[PDB]
Design an enzyme around this catalytic site. Structure first.
Site, PDB file in Angstrom:
ATOM      1  N   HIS A 201     111.951  42.468  97.282  1.00 47.00           N
ATOM      2  CA  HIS A 201     113.466  41.853  97.054  1.00 47.00           C
ATOM      3  C   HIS A 201     114.320  43.107  97.456  1.00 47.00           C
ATOM      4  CE1 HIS A 201     111.766  37.917  95.988  1.00 47.00           C
ATOM      5  NE2 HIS A 201     111.573  38.025  97.053  1.00 47.00           N
TER       6      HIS A 201
ATOM      7  N   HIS B 195     120.699  47.562  91.418  1.00 47.03           N
ATOM      8  CA  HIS B 195     120.065  47.146  92.401  1.00 47.03           C
ATOM      9  C   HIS B 195     121.187  47.422  93.323  1.00 47.03           C
ATOM     10  CE1 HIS B 195     121.328  43.711  91.178  1.00 47.03           C
ATOM     11  NE2 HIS B 195     121.432  43.043  92.841  1.00 47.03           N
TER      12      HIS B 195
ATOM     13  N   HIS C  73     121.594  46.116  97.971  1.00 46.54           N
ATOM     14  CA  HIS C  73     121.453  45.961  98.847  1.00 46.54           C
ATOM     15  C   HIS C  73     121.566  46.752 100.362  1.00 46.54           C
ATOM     16  CE1 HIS C  73     121.363  42.136  96.670  1.00 46.54           C
ATOM     17  NE2 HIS C  73     121.995  42.466  96.070  1.00 46.54           N
TER      18      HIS C  73
ATOM     19  N   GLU D 229     127.214  42.859 101.094  1.00 48.69           N
ATOM     20  CA  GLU D 229     127.433  41.211 100.490  1.00 48.69           C
ATOM     21  C   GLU D 229     128.170  40.858 100.545  1.00 48.69           C
ATOM     22  OE1 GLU D 229     124.443  40.877  97.234  1.00 48.69           O
ATOM     23  OE2 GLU D 229     123.234  40.422  99.171  1.00 48.69           O
TER      24      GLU D 229
ATOM     25  N   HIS E 277     124.850  46.975  93.499  1.00 50.71           N
ATOM     26  CA  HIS E 277     125.083  46.124  92.025  1.00 50.71           C
ATOM     27  C   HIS E 277     124.747  46.194  90.899  1.00 50.71           C
ATOM     28  CE1 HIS E 277     125.534  42.297  95.275  1.00 50.71           C
ATOM     29  NE2 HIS E 277     126.781  42.860  94.829  1.00 50.71           N
TER      30      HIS E 277
END
Ligand SMILES: [Co+2]
Length: 257
Positions: free
Chosen positions: A61, A91, A93, A103, A116
């Protein structure tokens, strides 16, 4: 399973995780014209001098850089928070294009990526107990834009080849997360959720106003990761972001005028 693909993406998650349609879901759009300064807030205290990174893992992911959270080594306090929150992992995104990947959004602006830093409230004893509580986690979110390189990110970029595919991990000791922070700790905060399944509503979000810059080369190497496992057809790990969710009965507060 759930993912970001063509038939298992964010718009499907509610079938297995009905809280995806809940009251306190993340991310959200941050409207700078309605977020209100809160004088009751304090400055953030980021205490990362004693951080002990351990390992980096491609979980199919994203990738997680994992820390030793068995002592108060890398902690977040202050701000909107009561008590002490220990860093467990960070991690990112990111997008397939520089115009998307974050996000949270700011006045509907999407950044190229979002970092994050995940922390859990020590009063609950471990991560797994913390995620069952409304005040279990504190996530420090940091936007990334493409511009100059971020020197403190380069050690992460240079290990990515070693964890190309799902389930691979590598030693990742002696990494200093301070090198991922912008100059200012001004922030927005609101109550929300994890942004991946199980989408639990356990997070105090703290989103920094100032983005960090990364280079086009650094982002390109993120986009060479794979969602798939080794020996499977390649599916590039890109666009691993959930879109903004309805704010509902929440207010976003700002630490700055
Ligand atoms: Co995240």
């Amino acid at each position: 399973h759930w993912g970001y693909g063509k038939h298992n993406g964010p718009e499907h998650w509610h079938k297995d995780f009905p809280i995806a349609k809940g009251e306190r879901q993340s991310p959200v759009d941050i409207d700078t014209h309605t977020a209100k300064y809160d004088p009751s807030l304090k400055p953030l205290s980021v205490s990362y001098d004693q951080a002990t990174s351990l390992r980096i893992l491609n979980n199919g992911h994203a990738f997680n850089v994992e820390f030793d959270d068995s002592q108060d080594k890398a902690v977040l306090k202050g701000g909107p928070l009561d008590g002490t929150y220990r860093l467990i992992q960070f991690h990112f995104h990111w997008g397939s294009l520089d115009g998307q990947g974050s996000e949270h959004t700011v006045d509907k602006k999407k950044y190229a990526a979002e970092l994050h830093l995940v922390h859990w409230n020590t009063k609950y004893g471990d991560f797994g107990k913390a995620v069952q509580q409304p005040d279990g986690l504190a996530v420090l979110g940091i936007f990334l834009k493409v511009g100059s390189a971020k020197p403190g990110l380069q050690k992460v970029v240079d290990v990515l080849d070693s964890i190309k595919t799902k389930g691979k991990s590598a030693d990742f000791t002696n990494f200093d997360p301070r090198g991922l922070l912008p100059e200012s700790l001004d922030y927005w905060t609101y109550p929300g959720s994890l942004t991946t399944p199980p989408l639990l509503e356990c997070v105090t979000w703290i989103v920094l106003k100032e983005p960090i810059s990364v280079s086009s080369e650094q982002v390109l190497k993120f986009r060479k990761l794979n969602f798939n496992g080794e020996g499977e057809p390649e599916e590039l790990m890109v666009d691993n972001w959930r879109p903004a969710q309805p704010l509902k009965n929440r207010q976003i507060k700002a630490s700055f005028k």
